[PDB]
Design a protein around this ligand. Structure first.
Ligand SMILES: [Zn+2]
Ligand SMILES: [Zn+2]
Length: 59
């Protein structure tokens, strides 16, 4: 299993993210989503992270 030690999902709060992790390119603090949240975010927006922000798979 792919376990992203150190990273939690800023939509649902799962920590660590297991499986795919999407990491915000624009976000300083940092902003991460799990696969389930990324394939539906949320209140998932606030702060520094706007819907204008793009995320990419963490590799
Ligand atoms: Zn999530
Ligand atoms: Zn962001």
């Amino acid at each position: 299993s792919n376990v992203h030690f150190g990273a939690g999902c800023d939509s649902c709060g799962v920590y660590p993210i297991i499986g795919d992790r999407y990491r915000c390119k624009d976000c300083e603090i940092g902003y991460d989503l799990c696969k389930d949240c990324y394939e539906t975010s949320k209140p998932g927006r606030f702060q520094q992270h706007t819907p204008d922000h793009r995320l990419e798979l963490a590799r």
